[PDB]
């Protein structure tokens, strides 16, 4: 069902001298849910219950997000993809995930997750993905309505929009969900970002890291790498397509639809489709996992 209640209890672990928060419920092989910008583990709260008893249900808060510590000192050079990956790699190592992991990814969680999967292919039992960066992007991949704003994030105007005015949390997020969010839902999304300034840095550093039109070169290469790999990997995949969708449409959906050993369903949603179709998404992931774990 829907609802504003978080799933399970937030746990904390020290990683590289910082505290990171995560959900870890149940026993067995992990089903690892990874949020992106500007969300947290909370994004998965109505989806994870569908996987009850099918494995160890894990959802991590990226550094500087959710209940994870902020980086100190924060600035325009902090919260790059490389920095997030260092923290997330270390967190996933510390969680003792074993060698039959199911990944469930979205947004930046998909860049992180696809990259991790490429680097740890022997430990990956299945990949479920939605509204994901399937390959390096181009401006024409962005819906016409969102293109200008993301361009503005990647300019000097970004600090005012995001650090001062919290545009990613307050405008982009609700603007890419079809149903109206409740007071409690927006309160949960707002919470890590209540204060103006550096507290909000992760939500600006992220759009500045998106691999678009060849920049930044490091993230482009990482996505080119996992794009080639995923297009050839026989690892079972679940592609949750969205209507109207937002990111994973047109060219980049044409591309991910070439990936082998892949099941597809379509659900209602724009970008943050977890808020529109959590039961359809959860049911599909649960069925995928059941087939992977007979």
Residue 153 binds: one of Ca ion, Cl ion, none (C-beta under 5 to 8 A by kind): none
Q: Decide if 107 is catalytic.
A: yes
Nearer to Ca ion, 146 or 264 (CB): 146
Q: Decide if 271 is catalytic.
A: yes
Q: Is residue 189 classed as helix, strand or coil in its secondary structure?
A: helix
- Residue from 107, 141, 275, 280 carrying the catalytic annotation: 107
Reported residue count of the chain is: 294
- Residue from 61, 271, 276, 280 carrying the catalytic annotation: 271
Nearer to Cl ion, 106 or 280 (CB): 106
Binding site for Ca ion (CB under 5 A): 174, 177
Count of H-run helices and E-run strands, the chain = 11, 8
Residue 113 binds: one of Cl ion, Ca ion, none (C-beta under 5 to 8 A by kind): none
**Residue 185: CB minimum distance to Ca ion, A:** 11
The answer to whether the annotation marks 177 as part of a ligand binding site is yes
Q: How far is Cα 47 from Cα 53, in angstroms, rounded to an integer?
A: 13
Is the bond leading into 88 cis (omega within 30 degrees of zero)? no
Helix crossing, 108-119 with 81-94: angle to 10°?
Answer: 60
**Residue 175: CB minimum distance to Ca ion, A:** 6
Q: How far is CA 223 from CA 121, 211, 216, 228, 259, in A?
A: 15, 8, 11, 9, 15
Q: How far is Cα 237 from Cα 259, in angstroms, rounded to an integer?
A: 8
Q: Decide if 279 is catalytic.
A: no
**Residue 206: CB minimum distance to Ca ion, A:** 20
The dihedral region occupied by 76, where left means phi > 0, alpha psi between -120 and 50, and beta the remainder, is alpha
**Residue 252: CB minimum distance to Ca ion, A:** 23
Nearer to Cl ion, 66 or 282 (CB): 66
Residue 39 binds: one of Cl ion, Ca ion, none (C-beta under 5 to 8 A by kind): none
Binding site for Cl ion (CB under 5 A): 37, 206-207
Catalytic residues: 107, 131, 271
């Amino acid at each position: 069902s829907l609802g504003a209640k978080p799933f399970g209890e937030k746990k904390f672990i020290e990683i590289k001298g910082r505290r990171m928060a995560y959900i870890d419920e149940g026993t067995g092989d992990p089903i690892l849910f990874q949020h992106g910008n500007p969300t947290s583990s909370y994004l998965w709260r109505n989806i994870m219950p569908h996987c009850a008893g099918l494995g160890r249900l894990i959802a991590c808060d990226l550094i500087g997000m959710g209940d994870s510590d902020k980086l100190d000192p924060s600035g325009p050079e902090r919260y790059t993809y490389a920095e997030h990956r260092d923290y997330l790699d270390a967190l996933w190592e510390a969680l003792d995930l074993g060698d039959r992991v199911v990944l469930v990814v979205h947004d930046w969680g998909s860049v992180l997750g696809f990259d991790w999967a490429r680097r740890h292919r022997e430990r990956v039992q299945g990949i479920a993905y939605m509204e994901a960066v399937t390959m390096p992007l181009e401006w024409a991949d962005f819906p016409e309505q969102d293109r200008d704003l993301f361009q503005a994030f990647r300019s000097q105007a970004g600090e005012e929009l995001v650090l001062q005015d919290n545009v990613f949390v307050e405008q982009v997020l609700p603007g890419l969900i079809l149903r109206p969010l409740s007071e409690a839902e927006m309160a949960a999304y707002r919470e890590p970002f209540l204060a103006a300034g550096e507290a909000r840095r992760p939500t600006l550093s992220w759009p500045r890291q998106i691999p678009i039109a060849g920049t930044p070169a490091d993230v482009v290469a990482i996505a080119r790498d996992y794009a080639g790999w995923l297009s050839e990997s026989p690892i079972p995949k679940l592609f949750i397509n969205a209507e109207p969708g937002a990111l994973t449409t047109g060219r980049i959906r044409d591309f991910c639809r070439t990936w082998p050993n892949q099941t597809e369903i379509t659900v209602a949603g724009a970008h943050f489709i977890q808020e529109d179709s959590p039961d359809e998404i959860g049911a599909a992931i649960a069925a995928f996992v059941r087939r992977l774990r007979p």
